[PDB]
Paper text:
Kinetochores are large multi-subunit complexes that attach centromeric chromatin to microtubules of the mitotic spindle, enabling sister chromatid segregation in mitosis. The inner kinetochore constitutive centromere associated network (CCAN) complex assembles onto the centromere-specific Cenp-A nucleosome (Cenp-ANuc), thereby coupling the centromere to the microtubule-binding outer kinetochore. CCAN is a conserved 14–16 subunit complex composed of discrete modules. Cenp-TW interacts directly with Cenp-HIKM to form a six-subunit complex (Cenp-HIKM-TW) in vertebrates, and a five-subunit complex (Cenp-HIK-TW) in budding yeast.
Here, we determined the crystal structure of the Saccharomyces cerevisiae Cenp-HIKHead-TW sub-module, revealing how Cenp-HIK and Cenp-TW interact at the conserved Cenp-HIKHead–Cenp-TW interface. The structure of the S. cerevisiae Cenp-HIKHead sub-module at 2.9 Å resolution is essentially identical to its counterpart in the thermophilic yeast. Cenp-HIKHead is assembled from the N-terminus of Cenp-IHead (residues 1–241) and the C-termini of Cenp-H (residues 147–181, Cenp-HHead) and Cenp-K (residues 136–237, Cenp-KHead). Although we crystallized a complex of Cenp-HIKHead-Cenp-TW using the full-length Cenp-T subunit, in our structure the N-terminal 268 residues are disordered, consistent with disorder predictions, with only the HFD and HFE being visible. The crystal structure of the Cenp-HIKHead-TW sub-module reveals that the major contacts between Cenp-HIKHead and Cenp-TW involve Cenp-IHead and Cenp-KHead of Cenp-HIK and Cenp-T of Cenp-TW, with Cenp-HHead and Cenp-W making minor contributions. In interface 1, the C-terminal anti-parallel α-helices (H4 and H5) of the HFE of Cenp-T combine with H3 of Cenp-K to create a compact three helix bundle. Interface 1 is dominated by a network of electrostatic interactions involving Arg206 and Arg210 of Cenp-K and Asp338, Glu357 and Ser354 of Cenp-T. In interface 2, the conserved L5 loop (residues 177–182) of Cenp-IHead inserts into a cavity within the Cenp-TW dimer formed by the interface of H1 of the Cenp-T HFD, turn connecting H4-H5 of the Cenp-T HFE, and N-terminus of Cenp-W. His177Cenp-I in the L5 loop, a highly conserved residue, makes an important contribution by providing a C-terminal helix cap to H4 of Cenp-T. We fitted the Cenp-HIKHead-TW sub-module to the previously determined cryo-EM map of the S. cerevisiae CCAN–Cenp-ANuc complex. This showed that the HEAT repeat domain of Cenp-IHead and C-terminal HFD of Cenp-T of the Cenp-HIKHead-TW sub-module interact with the nucleosome DNA gyre at a site close to the Cenp-ANuc dyad axis.
Residue numbers in the entry:
A (entry chain H): 147 to 181
B (entry chain I): 2 to 241
C (entry chain T): 269 to 360
D (entry chain W): 1 to 15, 36 to 89
E (entry chain K): 136 to 218, 222 to 237
């Protein structure tokens, strides 16, 4: 289904927002912009 | 100019054991030529990281260097905000071995970023999404709120930026005891979301749940911005 | 001497807690909590004036506030700002 | 007033890193008792079927606290 | 034609998350006396549990080895913890919703 490409786009979004929060609140010091 | 690198590269080698009058020379030499040629963005990156990792400069003189010599000669680099970002926060159970940087120095770095907001570089939109959430997360550090909230606000441009999960983060923090100013800073961010996406029931009723005297909000909306610093900066940016 | 603690300060330390439940305090109840904020502070000022490392929260379990130290962190999370939370975490 | 503010308030009427943290722990203890008391109060104000916590509920609950605990 | 760059991006986030766990987050746990891959899998499982919004995930799913993780999510304010049993379920806040 071409609507389940709208689902990987949504887990694409949460992994991204998840890492930012792990990195910041675990004192990571190599925070960048990953593709 | 090239002089501002033997300067900067020297401070890098300084430590305990250096003739402290040798130091004060190099600092004054820094205060001097920074006001003249201004600071080249890669130099500025090397400066800010020594400012956040070395012990051999009084912290209140660190603040002074940010308040009187952080004068960029153009647009800021993205690798520069990452260098600042990677030095903000609190020591955590995964990060106890970390060199952590005095909070006052931290917030002063932020206040400085507010002054040079117009020099921020262009972000790809994926990059803008990231940057928008970092500052919101950072916003929660009680001692960065005063100066983060302008950055989280000014980055709020399209109604894509304002989403529900950012709202509770904000609402949690406003209502949260153990924060003093957060209701002021929070309503602000909210009003900018209101002023941006339009109606949205969630936002408008959040603002109600946070009652602010209508006069802390007027002490929060107006910032003093140190005109002397932007004076010197306009001069630098004019020249080359 | 500022022994009676400000009403507006109470109405802030707790306004989230009240909203998060059912609690509707008129201004009259607010005064009542103020004078009681004294005898409740009165209580533990003689409870243990000894400031101990280990039994500090062990004292707190005895009071029926918590069951363990995990509960104390859940309290830190809801009463302290972010950066103190990371601190207290290592203290436990 | 915030929670750290409440910490120094408490200790000033009575009295280095490890002792700072306990001061904070103590400030959470005050609000923990205090909200136990307001929650006790709400239940006996809802026992009687009322909209609203009335003052007696408060001094009931506060002594209902210091007696048992 | 625009679909296999996002599925491309999707693996490059999964292994980025993985590489960050194996690389930084789990080593700074340093529990299980030295079981960095025995623990990474514990933790990796937990994150895909969170990311896929497994509703069966509860506080008891955290070993006393991995409980800081839980505390880290708690601090970051990016999970909701809710209890008929006296047990407590954990889900990620919603990052995709737009209303």
């Amino acid at each position: 289904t071409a609507g389940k490409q709208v689902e990987v786009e949504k887990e694409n979004e949460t992994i991204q927002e998840l890492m930012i929060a792990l990195q910041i609140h675990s004192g990571y010091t190599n925070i960048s912009y990953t593709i | 100019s090239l002089i501002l690198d033997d300067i900067i590269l020297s401070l890098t080698n300084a430590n305990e054991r250096t003739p402290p009058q040798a130091l004060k020379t190099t600092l004054s030499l820094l205060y001097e030529k920074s006001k003249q040629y201004g600071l080249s963005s890669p130099q500025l990156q090397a400066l800010v990281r020594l400012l956040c990792e070395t012990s051999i400069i009084d912290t209140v003189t660190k603040v002074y260097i940010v308040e009187n010599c952080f004068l960029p000669d153009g647009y800021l680099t993205k690798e520069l905000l990452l260098e600042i970002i990677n030095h903000l926060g609190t020591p955590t159970v995964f990060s106890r071995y970390r060199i952590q940087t005095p909070p006052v120095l931290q917030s002063a770095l932020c206040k400085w970023l507010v002054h040079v907001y117009f020099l921020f570089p262009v972000h790809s939109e994926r990059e803008h999404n990231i940057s928008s959430s970092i500052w919101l997360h950072l916003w929660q550090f009680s001692f960065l709120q005063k100066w983060i909230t302008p950055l989280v606000i000014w980055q709020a441009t399209t109604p894509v930026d304002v989403k529900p999960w950012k709202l509770s983060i904000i609402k949690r923090c406003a209502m949260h005891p153990g924060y003093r100013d957060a209701p002021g800073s929070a309503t602000l961010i909210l009003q900018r979301f209101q002023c941006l996406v339009g109606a949205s029931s969630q936002i408008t009723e959040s603002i109600i749940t946070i009652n602010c005297n209508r006069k802390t909000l007027k002490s929060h909306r107006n910032l003093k911005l140190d005109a002397h610093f932007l004076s010197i900066l306009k001069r630098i940016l004019s020249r080359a | 001497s500022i022994k009676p603690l400000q009403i507006m300060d109470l109405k802030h330390l707790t306004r989230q807690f009240l909203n998060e439940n059912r609690i509707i305090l008129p201004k009259q109840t607010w005064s009542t909590i103020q004078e009681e904020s004294l005898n409740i502070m009165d209580f533990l000022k003689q409870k243990i004036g000894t400031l101990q490392k280990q039994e500090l929260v062990d004292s707190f379990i005895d009071m029926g506030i918590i069951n363990n130290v995990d509960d104390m962190f859940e309290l830190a999370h809801e009463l302290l700002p972010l950066e103190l939370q990371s601190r207290i975490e290592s203290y436990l | 007033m915030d929670t750290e503010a409440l910490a120094n308030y408490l200790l000033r009427q009575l009295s280095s890193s490890q002792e700072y943290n306990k001061k904070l722990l103590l400030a959470c203890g005050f609000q923990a008792i205090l909200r136990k008391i307001l929650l006790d109060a709400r239940t006996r104000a809802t026992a009687e079927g009322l909209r609203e916590v009335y003052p007696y509920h408060i001094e009931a609950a506060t002594q209902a606290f210091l007696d048992s605990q | 034609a625009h679909i296999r760059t996002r599925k491309a991006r999707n693996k490059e986030l999964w292994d980025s998350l993985a590489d960050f766990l194996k690389g930084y987050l789990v080593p700074n746990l340093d529990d299980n006396d030295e079981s960095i891959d025995s623990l990474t899998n514990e933790v990796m499982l937990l994150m895909k549990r969170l990311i896929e919004h497994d509703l069966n995930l509860t506080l008891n799913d955290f070993s006393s080895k991995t409980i800081p993780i839980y505390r880290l999510l708690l601090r970051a304010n990016i999970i909701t913890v809710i209890e008929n049993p006296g047990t407590k379920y954990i889900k990620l806040i919603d990052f995709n919703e737009t209303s």
